[PDB]
Design a protein around this ligand. Sequence first.
Ligand SMILES: *[C@@H]1O[C@H](CO)[C@@H](O)[C@H](O)[C@H]1NC(C)=O
Lengths: 50, 51
Amino acid sequence: FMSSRRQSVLVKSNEEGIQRVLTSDYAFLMESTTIEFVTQRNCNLTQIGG
Amino acid sequence: LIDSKGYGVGTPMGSPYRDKITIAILQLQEEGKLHMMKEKWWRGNGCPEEE
Ligand SMILES: *[C@@H]1O[C@H](CO)[C@@H](O)[C@H](O)[C@H]1NC(C)=O
């Protein structure tokens, strides 16, 4: 997917990617420690998978 | 969509007028001649979707 949608879904910052889930269908792979931040300051963004 | 294609202006390899047409295709998004000519040629019938 990342080759086929290069520069299409690829964000270059975390909070713009936080915004990009907040806009549309977006999954935003990062590490869980920053996921532990954004989830615990927003009751709208949870963590599928562990 | 399925991919992210685009069409390009065909020029010979090492075109003499490459930048004469390169920044010329850069300037057609400025006033939007790509966009102000987009509403005409793609919309031959204003198809009334209701369903
Ligand atoms: C997502 O965040 C809060 C809940 O944490 C919600 O009230 C807010 O409206 C949502 N943001 C949107 C829909 O843009």
